[PDB]
């Protein structure tokens, strides 16, 4: 169940990719994936390429995968190391969530930060008070690191 599901997900990704995000195993290890996300056009991250590391637990699909950003991103809700944990409560992950939905959700987060849950207090304060400075800094970091 934890390997047939992964093979089906990989085949589906190779069937009809979202045309922006990509994902594939590194070398030969189906439980460790590397993914690529393109910066949304209508956001300061436009043009960047962000790499993610996905570790599927052995309990997959019952337990969610560990998704961690690798490229540094100036975002109000992404810590320095990068950690995208999915939690409104322990009531949102179900075996019916593929890995494509998670990538789409990550793109949504990139294009619409949530300021009411500040994981990085300084960036959240800048976003709330002065939006232009936040945009400038975000695009500067995208230029410096993502490219």
């Amino acid at each position: 169940m934890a390997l047939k599901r992964i093979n089906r997900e990989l085949a589906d990704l190779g069937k009809d990719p979202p045309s922006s995000s990509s994902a594939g195993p590194v070398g030969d290890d189906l439980f460790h994936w590397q993914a690529t996300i393109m910066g949304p056009a209508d956001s300061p991250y436009a043009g960047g390429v962000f790499f993610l590391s996905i570790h599927f637990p052995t309990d997959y699909p019952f337990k969610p995968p560990k998704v961690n950003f690798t490229t540094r991103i100036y975002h109000p809700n992404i810590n320095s190391n990068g950690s995208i944990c999915l939690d409104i409560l322990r009531d949102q992950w179900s075996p019916a969530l593929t890995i494509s939905k998670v990538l789409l959700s990550i793109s949504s987060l990139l294009t619409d930060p949530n300021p009411d849950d500040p994981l990085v207090p300084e960036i959240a304060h800048v976003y709330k008070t002065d939006r232009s400075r936040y945009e400038l800094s975000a695009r500067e970091w995208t230029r410096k690191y993502a490219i």
């Binding site: 810590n79 944990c85 019916a96 959700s105 619409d112 849950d117």
Partner: protein, 75 residues
């Protein structure tokens, strides 16, 4: 007119709506069909999150558009 709302579980729900309908009314229809509370609905269209208080026409939603009901990642 008609539109399509694709959820998390890969299901596709087709709805009969009008361009003047509020976002709240659409979330209400999705709650009636899927049982998802409006407070937990995160609707995305063309990379932009639909906000309460506006209309579908504000987002240029036309015949047989496709929306996404997406996870609310926290960080």
């Amino acid at each position: 007119m008609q539109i399509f709302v694709k959820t998390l579980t890969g299901k596709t729900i087709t709805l009969e709506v009008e361009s003047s309908d509020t976002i709240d009314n659409v979330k209400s229809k999705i709650q009636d069909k899927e049982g998802i509370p409006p407070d937990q609905q995160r609707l995305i269209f063309a990379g932009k999150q639909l906000e309460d208080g506006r209309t579908l026409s504000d987002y240029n939603i036309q015949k047989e558009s496709t929306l996404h009901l997406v996870l609310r990642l926290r960080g």
